[PDB]
Symmetry: D3
Subunit: 267 residues, 6 copies
Amino acid sequence: PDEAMLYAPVEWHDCSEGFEDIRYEKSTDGIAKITINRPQVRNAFRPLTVKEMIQALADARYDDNIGVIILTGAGDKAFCSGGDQKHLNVLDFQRQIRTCPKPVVAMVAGYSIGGGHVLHMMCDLTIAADNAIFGQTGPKVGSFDGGWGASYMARIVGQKKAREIWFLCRQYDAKQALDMGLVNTVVPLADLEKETVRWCREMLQNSPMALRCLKAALNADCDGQAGLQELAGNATMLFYMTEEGQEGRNAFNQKRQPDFSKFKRNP
Amino acid sequence: DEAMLYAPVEWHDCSEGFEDIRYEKSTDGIAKITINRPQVRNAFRPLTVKEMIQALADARYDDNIGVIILTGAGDKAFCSGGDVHHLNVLDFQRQIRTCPKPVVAMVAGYSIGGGHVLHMMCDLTIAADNAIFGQTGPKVGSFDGGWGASYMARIVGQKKAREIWFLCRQYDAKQALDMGLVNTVVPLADLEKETVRWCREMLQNSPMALRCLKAALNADCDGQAGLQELAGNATMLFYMTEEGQEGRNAPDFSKFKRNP
Amino acid sequence: PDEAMLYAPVEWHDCSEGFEDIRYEKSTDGIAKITINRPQVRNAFRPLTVKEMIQALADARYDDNIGVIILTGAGDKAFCSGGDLNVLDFQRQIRTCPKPVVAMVAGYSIGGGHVLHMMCDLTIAADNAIFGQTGPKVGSFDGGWGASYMARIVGQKKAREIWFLCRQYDAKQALDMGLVNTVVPLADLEKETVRWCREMLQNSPMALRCLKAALNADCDGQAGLQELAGNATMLFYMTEEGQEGRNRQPDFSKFKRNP
Amino acid sequence: DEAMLYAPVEWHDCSEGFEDIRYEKSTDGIAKITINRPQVRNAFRPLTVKEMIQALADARYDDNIGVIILTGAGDKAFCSGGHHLNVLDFQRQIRTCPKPVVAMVAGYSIGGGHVLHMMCDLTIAADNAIFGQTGPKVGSFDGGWGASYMARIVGQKKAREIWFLCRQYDAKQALDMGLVNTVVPLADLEKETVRWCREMLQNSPMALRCLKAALNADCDGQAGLQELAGNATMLFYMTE
Amino acid sequence: DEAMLYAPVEWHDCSEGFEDIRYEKSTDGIAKITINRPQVRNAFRPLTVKEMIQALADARYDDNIGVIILTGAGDKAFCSGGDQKVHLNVLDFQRQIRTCPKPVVAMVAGYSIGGGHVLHMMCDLTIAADNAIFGQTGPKVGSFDGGWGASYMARIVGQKKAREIWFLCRQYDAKQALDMGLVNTVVPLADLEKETVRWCREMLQNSPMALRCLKAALNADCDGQAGLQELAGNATMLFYMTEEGQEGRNAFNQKRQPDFSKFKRNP
Amino acid sequence: PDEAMLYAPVEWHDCSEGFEDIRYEKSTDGIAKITINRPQVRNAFRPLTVKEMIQALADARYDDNIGVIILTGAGDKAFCSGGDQLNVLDFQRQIRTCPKPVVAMVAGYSIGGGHVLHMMCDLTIAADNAIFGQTGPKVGSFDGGWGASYMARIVGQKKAREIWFLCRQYDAKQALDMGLVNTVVPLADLEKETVRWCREMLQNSPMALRCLKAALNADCDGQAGLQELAGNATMLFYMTEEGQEGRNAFNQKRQPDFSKFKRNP
Ligand SMILES: [Cl-]
């Protein structure tokens, strides 16, 4: 749509009540924002942080006013620097982002590293500041994510770069990540939220149903039968919104056997 | 209820212009494709395939047809294999697969070689008690490693799929039933009677549901090609919803719930 | 494992406080039982039933004294007759549960109900159990695990027949098509299920957890990979080379680079 | 060598009976299916699709045709998108076509018109070409090959960007993301496209169909395996 | 004809250098690898795997061999698995049976247990004797096979029975194995090689190229790109036996650039 | 890792004894190097070359002192120009299932069968003179195995079809841009930079690298991939106490007792 709308000021309302490690805000125009708020530790998550993010995300998913989720870190220095070095419920969170019917965007300034780097990849889109830094650390610190951290990363950057990223554990700047297709765009640090909000509003103008259907379709290319469950799940929901889909329910209400003879067969 | 399911069938001939097949439609919406070459045990040649592609294309587009029966003429053979391309039966195989209406193999006598892959491709197989199944390719050198191999495994399992292909034995109806190759076995005389019952049980059901499920069961096998079928049904469904039609007429989408 | 241990009496302890639609019980020896408790309506689930079952399975999961979960219906006439779409979440949750889940089925397992039992790792059926779908009969479908996974159990011909015709199948037909693991007399249903549960409790829970993730991994693509690899990660922490990283730069030279 | 690849093409018309498409053949083996509705920016309607299915079926069955070009009339559009969904049949057809199909794109390749170019084995883009999806903007989606297969071309991050926002992408953006195979100035679109077709025509047509089936088989599961073992069978008739 | 199939078998010893296995060849193309440690019920130690790998490799490359039998010494045990008194190189042996371009038949008498059960599963076919006993033990003894021992079992018996076999670690007799499709046939113990040899001979009647392509094709439903590799390998092989496949080599002989215009372009 | 350590000279020790077509060397710090040594025929392989690469790669796998294998061609003109004028499929699986990272070091030609080999390696380090391509369709052959499907998992399906259907040659820069190689370095520095990448991987956990290698194959190789990935899990399981309990039970005569282990969520 028009830039005037897209770059309009963002109003965030606080819904962080009871959260220790994260902030949770909503805009009136449909965006929910989850902020890892541990900037002293470069926004490393600990098990509490994960549990809170799971709650915030369950909430965003169930809130009809919300159509897009942003995941970010407080400050300019880190998105998320990984698991806290000082059990593995972050897997749950990965699943939860994967199966969330609304687009989830990673708004990344500075460090996205380790468990934190898998977090941004799990998100549908990544918006990077020009100061953003990406990479894995597992093999360097005796650990690994060989699940979506591995196979899904390949589906993003190809198998030669996935092997480089994991095996060597180097760091990559924003341009390097842009070039290998690891992030969707690179924007100046001062404009990060401006542009991220723009991208969200662009999606918000589009069909929520279409967006969830394509999301599941894109997962379905990776997640075998789990993907099929999402994709058919939307198909079922769509069916219930058609007349033939409503006959069974109308039949029961009217105390009669369903009659499918009165419906056209398509080719 | 038996009375309805076992009521007689009114077949109308639709075989106009076909040499190798007969093609019939019933008033209650059953289309039957019959290979009409029992002088060569119902083996197909390219023309036979080309005509089956036509019939099935007709059935697919006919609003009155819900279920297709594929069968052979007579009692001795369903299809004993191959003898307008050398291998167009592959095309016909796909078209059974992506056909949004259930296809049922009505098998009397022999279902061998290419003829055996054909009944397997059908969503269901009703077998007469005189039915015989098996592959032969390996004997003469030929073979089917596509759905002829992989998809057979998703029916009978990997041990028996290797057995059937590697030895190329013949199996009677009882053997086929116990390994899950056919859905049921009936006395030869009642073969059509039971097939029509199965067909009618399907006709009482939601055609849109049948078509989505069939696409879903295919999608466990056909990777991105199965996804195409399944998502295409979703797209189709979408256009019948209010939200889908709102985008067409334009687009204010905020008036539709962002469901969890 | 001798019969005397396996067929010992079972002590259930009620954990049902705050549950309106379900019962939730635990045994001394590590079995968590989730019982759908709406027999007036043949044990159909509404959204409340699903939310409670999710809660109870979440609890069973995080309880270290639980090794097996039994899912069942109250009474002798129905396991679950289907819906009265959050049941998708419950399905996902049964799938990724690191402990064996057992459907214990008496009478009707139908529709959404039938998909629940299939989702469970095993199914012990009473001789009075009935199975089948009803979607196409009532204008709906389950085309996720309800379809693909059914095929990985009974094969594609049977899967197509079950769905397309929506017939009903007795315990005998279900057993013969591989749909259930075993059929026992109605009176012995819990007795025999507890036995299967106890036999699993005698085995390595870490082994069961890996194998389950591994069996899922043959159906669930990268989602199965996430589970399996996640177990590998868990195992890795429990080793010295995995511990070395957390303990100055790390040094892995003191470790074999095996073949 | 450049002189051969760049020689003039001898087109022969085969557009008999077609309202919405042109269909031409060269002596050296190229078939060209042109969408001929430039007024509506080469959008397809059920007839167009029915006619493209016919032409593509012809090309597949002609021993003289080695390569097929799919394109739009004029310099402003390739195809700006759309029984109802017989374009799904045409997708399947492009997929299983045992010969390379090359999308020659000038101007817009949008919506269903975008999926069509993706479905082609190769895409040769003019410098004025524009790409994107529109479904979520216009209450539709292609979550079949339009989704998964897009991922296999551009990666999951770009595929989600393309579908979720439905922006437009210029030729350079398309090239850079692996979406098209090359970009040429508009005046050279067909000249360069024909060269690519002629480089494939110098190669083994059996080798090409086997490789296309193999690349498909990385996506289409048992349907990929069927294409693949179909070729092995056709190979095993060529032996003793 | 039953006269040919049940004719006497002439076995030729080729066990030179082996300590844990016998290795024989018949004059009509069957290779038989026999695990020979019956005092420990044919459990394999690392040396047993090394020798089974050599023997298998030899059978694969011997053009005179069309079919391979895997079996154990005596009537009481096929193979009861890893030796408790004791690298993980049975995975190599597993992979070798998988990619073996010839049919491999597990001839099972008595126990096929743990890793020994996994070996019989990997074999294309299994001929069991009425005394045969099957099952896993991993969870009973703190171990597991999660690769082919899990996933591929599922493709034999289905997900319900696979979960049963692995989770409970019971034993199953011959009738039970037959019923769940775990084995191809059950025969009397006295007749075990009589019958097994018959099956082998029914396979020798057919084309080795055809068998090879079908084995590859059926592996291809399970093994992703690895399967495709076997499948294409055969296709590349078939190709060379054609004119168009020979046209490249004849171009380089005649010192000319290849010409492919003279070949039809089938539909 | 510091630059001084990474760019330290490399001491290679010859291990090529009995090898005709290949050299095989090992450095003290854990790199093995298989060099195709037929520069006269642009380092193309004949059957014996493949037999020796199998042996040498088998050795590197079983040598516990080695953690990374480099694959390369002699001289600066070629890496491998492919088949000469099917056991190379065995060497392919062997690179695939090698629990240690395998790096292709490419100078000059990597072509045909020689091109599939570089793609098969986990990483590819390319010199600025490197040339990549297929030739099969031009000469009436094809690799429709990992040569096709896996190629697409590197460069995308549009480039995969372009590379196969046309059989052109691509310079280093083109190879780098479609993501076919990992980096392009000046020819003079080829081994300097290559050994650097190996050392960085050698500073990391060998157990981590093999799991992650299996996990990434497992996105391609179906149940075969699951066998690699589960095999590593089984292995790690033996290294835990719960896994040792089984065998400990047998050695102490008793029935195993798993009740004393935490049933985690
Ligand atoms: Cl030893």
